[PDB]
Amino acid sequence: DLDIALLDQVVSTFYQGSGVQQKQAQEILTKFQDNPDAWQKADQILQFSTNPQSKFIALSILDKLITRKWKLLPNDHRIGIRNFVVGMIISMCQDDEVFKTQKNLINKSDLTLVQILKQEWPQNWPEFIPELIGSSSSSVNVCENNMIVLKLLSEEVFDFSAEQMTQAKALHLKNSMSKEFEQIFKLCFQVLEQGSSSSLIVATLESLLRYLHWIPYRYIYETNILELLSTKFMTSPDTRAITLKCLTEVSNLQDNDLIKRQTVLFFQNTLQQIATSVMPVTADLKATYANANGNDQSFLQDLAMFLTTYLARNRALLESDESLRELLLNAHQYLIQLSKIEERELFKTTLDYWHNLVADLFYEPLKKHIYEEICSQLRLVIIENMVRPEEVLVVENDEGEIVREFVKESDTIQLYKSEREVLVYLTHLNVIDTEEIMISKLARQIDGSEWSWHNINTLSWAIGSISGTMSEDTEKRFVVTVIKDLLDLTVKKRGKDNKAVVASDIMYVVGQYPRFLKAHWNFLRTVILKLFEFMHETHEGVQDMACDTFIKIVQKCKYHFVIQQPRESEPFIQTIIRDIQKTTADLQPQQVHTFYKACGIIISEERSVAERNRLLSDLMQLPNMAWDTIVEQSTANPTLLLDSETVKIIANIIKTNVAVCTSMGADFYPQLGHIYYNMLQLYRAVSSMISAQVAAEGLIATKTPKVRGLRTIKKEILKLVETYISKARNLDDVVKVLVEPLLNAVLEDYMNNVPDARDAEVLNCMTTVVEKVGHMIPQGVILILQSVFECTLDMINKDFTEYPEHRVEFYKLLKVINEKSFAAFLELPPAAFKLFVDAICWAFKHNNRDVEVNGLQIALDLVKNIERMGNVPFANEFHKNYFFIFVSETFFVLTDSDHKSGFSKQALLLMKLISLVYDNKISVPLYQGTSNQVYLSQYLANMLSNAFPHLTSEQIASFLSALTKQYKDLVVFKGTLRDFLVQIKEVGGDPTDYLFAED
Amino acid sequence: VPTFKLVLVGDGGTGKTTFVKRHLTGEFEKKYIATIGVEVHPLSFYTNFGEIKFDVWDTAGLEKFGGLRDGYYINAQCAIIMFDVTSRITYKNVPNWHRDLVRVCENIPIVLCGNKVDVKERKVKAKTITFHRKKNLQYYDISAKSNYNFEKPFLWLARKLAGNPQLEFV
Amino acid sequence: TTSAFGAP
Amino acid sequence: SAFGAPAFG
Amino acid sequence: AFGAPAF
Amino acid sequence: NLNELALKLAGLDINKTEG
Numbered sequence A: 001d002l003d004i005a006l007l008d009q010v011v012s013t014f015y016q017g018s019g020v021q022q023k024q025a026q027e028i029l030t031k032f033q034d035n036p037d038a039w040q041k042a043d044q045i046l047q048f049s050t051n052p053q054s055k056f057i058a059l060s061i062l063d064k065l066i067t068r069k070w071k072l073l074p075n076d077h078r079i080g081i082r083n084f085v086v087g088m089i090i091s092m093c094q095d096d097e098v099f100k101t102q103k104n105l106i107n108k109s110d111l112t113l114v115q116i117l118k119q120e121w122p123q124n125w126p127e128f129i130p131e132l133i134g135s136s137s138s139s140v141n142v143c144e145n146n147m148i149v150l151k152l153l154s155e156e157v158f159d160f161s162a163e164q165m166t167q168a169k170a171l172h173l174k175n176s177m178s179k180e181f182e183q184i185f186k187l188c189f190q191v192l193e194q195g196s197s198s199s200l201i202v203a204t205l206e207s208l209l210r211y212l213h214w215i216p217y218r219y220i221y222e223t224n225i226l227e228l229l230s231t232k233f234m235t236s237p238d239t240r241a242i243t244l245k246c247l248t249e250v251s252n253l254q255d256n257d258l259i260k261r262q263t264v265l266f267f268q269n270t271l272q273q274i275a276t277s278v279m280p281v282t283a284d285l286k287a288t289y290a291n292a293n294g295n296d297q298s299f300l301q302d303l304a305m306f307l308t309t310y311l312a313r314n315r316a317l318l319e320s321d322e323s324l325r326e327l328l329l330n331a332h333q334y335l336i337q338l339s340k341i342e343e344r345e346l347f348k349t350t351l352d353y354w355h356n357l358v359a360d361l362f363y364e365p366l367k368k369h370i371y372e373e374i375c376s377q378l379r380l381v382i383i384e385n386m387v388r389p390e391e392v393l394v395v396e397n398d399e400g401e402i403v404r405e406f407v408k409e410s411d412t413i414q415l416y417k418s419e420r421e422v423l424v425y426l427t428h429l430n431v432i433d434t435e436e437i438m439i440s441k442l443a444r445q446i447d448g449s450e451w452s453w454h455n456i457n458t459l460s461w462a463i464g465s466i467s468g469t470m471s472e473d474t475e476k477r478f479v480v481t482v483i484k485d486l487l488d489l490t491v492k493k494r495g496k497d498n499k500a501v502v503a504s505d506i507m508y509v510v511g512q513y514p515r516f517l518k519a520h521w522n523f524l525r526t527v528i529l530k531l532f533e534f535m536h537e538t539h540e541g542v543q544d545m546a547c548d549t550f551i552k553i554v555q556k557c558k559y560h561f562v563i564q565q566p567r568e569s570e571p572f573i574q575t576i577i578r579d580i581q582k583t584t585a586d587l588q589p590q591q592v593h594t595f596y597k598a599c600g601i602i603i604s605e606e607r608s609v610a611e612r613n614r615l616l617s618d619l620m621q622l623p624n625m626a627w628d629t630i631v632e633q634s635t636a637n638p639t640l641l642l643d644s645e646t647v648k649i650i651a652n653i654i655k656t657n658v659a660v661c662t663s664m665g666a667d668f669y670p671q672l673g674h675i676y677y678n679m680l681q682l683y684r685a686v687s688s689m690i691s692a693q694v695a696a697e698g699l700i701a702t703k704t705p706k707v708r709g710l711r712t713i714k715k716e717i718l719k720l721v722e723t724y725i726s727k728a729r730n731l732d733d734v735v736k737v738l739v740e741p742l743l744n745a746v747l748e749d750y751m752n753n754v755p756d757a758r759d760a761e762v763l764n765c766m767t768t769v770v771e772k773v774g775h776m777i778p779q780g781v782i783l784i785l786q787s788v789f790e791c792t793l794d795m796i797n798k799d800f801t802e803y804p805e806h807r808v809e810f811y812k813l814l815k816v817i818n819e820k821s822f823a824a825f826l827e828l829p830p831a832a833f834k835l836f837v838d839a840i841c842w843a844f845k846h847n848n849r850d851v852e853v854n855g856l857q858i859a860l861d862l863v864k865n866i867e868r869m870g871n872v873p874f875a876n877e878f879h880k881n882y883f884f885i886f887v888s889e890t891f892f893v894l895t896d897s898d899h900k901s902g903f904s905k906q907a908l909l910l911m912k913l914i915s916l917v918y919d920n921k922i923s924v925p926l927y928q929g930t931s932n933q934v935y936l937s938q939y940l941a942n943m944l945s946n947a948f949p950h951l952t953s954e955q956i957a958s959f960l961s962a963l964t965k966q967y968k969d970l971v972v973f974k975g976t977l978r979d980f981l982v983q984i985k986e987v988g989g990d991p992t993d994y995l996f997a998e999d
Numbered sequence B: 001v002p003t004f005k006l007v008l009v010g011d012g013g014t015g016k017t018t019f020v021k022r023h024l025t026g027e028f029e030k031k032y033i034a035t036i037g038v039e040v041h042p043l044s045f046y047t048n049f050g051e052i053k054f055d056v057w058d059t060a061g062l063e064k065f066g067g068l069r070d071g072y073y074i075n076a077q078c079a080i081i082m083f084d085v086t087s088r089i090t091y092k093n094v095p096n097w098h099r100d101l102v103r104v105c106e107n108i109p110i111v112l113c114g115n116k117v118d119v120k121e122r123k124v125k126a127k128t129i130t131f132h133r134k135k136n137l138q139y140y141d142i143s144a145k146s147n148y149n150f151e152k153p154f155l156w157l158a159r160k161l162a163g164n165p166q167l168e169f170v
Numbered sequence C: 001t002t003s004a005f006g007a008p
Numbered sequence D: 001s002a003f004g005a006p007a008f009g
Numbered sequence E: 001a002f003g004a005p006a007f
Numbered sequence F: 001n002l003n004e005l006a007l008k009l010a011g012l013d014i015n016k017t018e019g
């Protein structure tokens, strides 16, 4: 269809054009490259095209042919393609302009040759390596490119062969390269010591970097390549980084004093060479990194990787000899300088090592004196680089509400914890030095020499991280001093801006020292009351700080709020509850809810149940009065929920209940009961209004402010119920009182809602119910299935994309139903059990991990359930009806291109299914005295031959043979499956590959 | 005004397209609609030193939709490698994406991004993420949904490409 | 129950 | 109807 | 499609 | 005891103009 000139035009349009025409050219190119017979256009393209991009694409088409259908080709074609690719590579190498400016095409060509080597070498090309080595002496460019070829070969065989090749083929190629590496190393070594050309030597070092991953130690330690690397190539600016990378891998390669002294030697040479030719230990790397000449940033990255890797493995080697003391401390001084570089990922690399060191010094304090200056330096470095321990996300939800929420397990948070751990160690190693550094840094905030918001915050985070380290008495003197200075600093600073910053840090520090707070009630009470005072401060961030600190402190110190302290006439929680209208008057709703949540934490600490309920009652007085009032108004006004102000008040009422229930859990029951029935009634009301309007106006009604206000009420109600039930201690009251009205209210409404009004949160609510009490409500589970299964399935069985949330929640619900209450399927008509099996297989076919995990898990659990029933009519009938359905469907997703995330579960499921037959657990023939074993093999062989006709009969037999012998060894069984996955994508696969485990 | 080709690669469903389109429209798409081959999106950032433009080549992560695959990488001047912190296998495939990428473009600035850090059940822990170290890649935790480090990848790339460490988006 | 919210 | 009609209280 | 055997 | 410290803390005021 497309001749050469037109292809060149399409390529040029795609890469250099834009917009619609670029898009149109792409679709032409994609079709062209995917054409099975396109490879015959390839050599003509490679011969005649005036476009390097066209040639790149031609090589891709060639690669497809080589990796998939090489063995179909006559031996003439193979040699022809072979000679052509080799010839093409050589031409580009002798062409100096092309060699310099078309590296991507030459690399692509080299990779193509390596693909051929994977097919032909060495059994059909035994002289390749000798032919490669001698061709290197013909031209300096061919020699350089040969290093690239050898590099790619090593990568494809050792680095990326797993899952790309069968285990047998991979072993074959690894052993092949192992047998001929002797002469490869000779060429590599020779070039390294003789070589003039920078680009040649760099390329040689790049290849060696990959060899080091797998080559025998003797090539590294019984030659003198280590000495050559550590002396010659560090003085050179173009080879420094790549040499450090090689030595780093060497530092990851015993009872051997020779190898020990060589390990010491290359480190000694490298460090000496760096100090001599590159930079001294006193070099400001922080500034050097910041200017970033050429690739200096990468060199310093590679240096930190080298030092940390070596020292983590070989520090004890350098310590066992005092002549190496200078080398040891210089290495660590370099690390100190590197740790000052403003580059997080670089800093994290050093920190991982400092953690190793200071832990060792703690458990071996006799070595401590050696590193005293290093540690003192390190204390300051970490203190000055402490990151924030807490992060908050500000997001708009689906109802248009702006919501704060704390980040969990982020990189920043993990970094804080690592920094804290090191600082905790360092504090114990020398508490005086630690205290002196923090105090003097604080003094430099006071005198203004180092004053900034970032620096005072950073220091606060550092100080707040070492609680429980100094002993209680030293801690007391330390915190008193710190709070004193910070209080004076607040007075000293001009501007509400700066004052708020220091004040927030005062509050942060005290919140980090609960032992200090608990020991002194008057001070703790003073802290809380000032936080209350801050809740009236409109200055940005202050109220959030006050509320965050409040709940943080009560989390640690709750006990002191429920008991009656000395010189108090009542537990302070009573004081808090009474003034709650005044305290929270200026807060935003979300902040008020946090306040109530904090009170809930405290009230849960009351051991007397009568008094706990009384406290809860008093706490909820304001929202209950608002709720009671609105309940009364509901009787007097049928159009009550059309008032947006009323809707908003009701929303905040429920949110307040959710907040308190979150912290109180099981203790929240009496409050829940006070509103439960009216709340459920409210739910049906607002959900009806939503569904009615969505039906009349369509999907766009979901975005309207009115509907979103109603859906907020709807979702908060479900959230409240879910929150309590998940925390309930009394499951009887859940079942006997809560569940039945809940199911009637939400399941019926969900069922009668129009599809675009059904909330997936209902399914998630039901999942929580079933998880908690599903084993106690078999009839309730059935009602759930009757209400949500078919109507939800019909929403998600047209495509794989629509209603993404219902899809996830649907199969989460099905999983826990199948887990906790499988009895529900035993009572249901066959037509519905069929729908159940259909739904599972439908989840298999998703390119959606969140859906596919549960689909697999359900299938696994289902087979486990039925197998458990034993020799019983239901189990036996299931086997006749569905055994091969699951077998073939599992084999389908296994062999399909994009279901790799479920591979582990698929393999397990297949093992389990095979177990049912080859362990004779199925008491009944599966076919309409032939044993089930041989009918299974016949089914599979026929299934596989049909689906993959290019497979030989011996391939299939050998595969099924291995499978039915390995179904109890997961690791081996997986390996056999991966081998099969490799072989179904190519032609002429070796059937003896499946004997890999046995030999 | 300089235009820089940016190639965006990573496993399917990691959030590459939703990341780009939120940068373009401000909207966050909930549905997973797999990209087929590649889509090119002009994306401008106004800085304190004027406009900088990216031609974002949003490539397909699913194998059946891969298209030209590494053919898309030609003339790339920078790159983002994306994975999903809720899915271990997407991080496991990072070396594979990086491999195909640098074989075409041997010395371009590359950012590794762990997306979806807003999700509660995080599977790829922060301590585990170290691949970028030996490859000299930048790394960021990001969330296209909750606006966490949302502009960091483009900011770092812009500074690297413009050779200006003081570059800020305005 | 004690309320009569209803759906207008 | 395949699962049977729901009986709501 | 939804109800069909994949193979 | 920390009465002196508690009193100081109680005086914490970001709206005073005594910088």
Ligand SMILES: Nc1nc2c(ncn2[C@@H]2O[C@H](COP(=O)(O)OP(=O)(O)OP(=O)(O)O)[C@@H](O)[C@H]2O)c(=O)[nH]1
Pocket (backbone or CB within 6 Å): B010, B011, B012, B013, B014, B015, B016, B017, B018, B019, B029, B030, B031, B032, B033, B034, B035, B036, B059, B060, B061, B062, B115, B116, B117, B118, B119, B142, B143, B144, B145, B146
């Ligand atoms: N929770 C959460 N979900 C996200 C985030 N980013 C994206 N997603 C979701 O993840 C899915 C990813 O969608 P896409 O952006 O199209 O995935 P992709 O990387 O482009 O996949 P391919 O086009 O096949 O290569 C979408 O359903 C998004 O809604 C995130 O930051 N947090």
Ligand SMILES: [Mg+2]
Pocket (backbone or CB within 6 Å): B016, B017, B018, B033, B034, B035, B058, B059, B060, B061
């Ligand atoms: Mg996409």
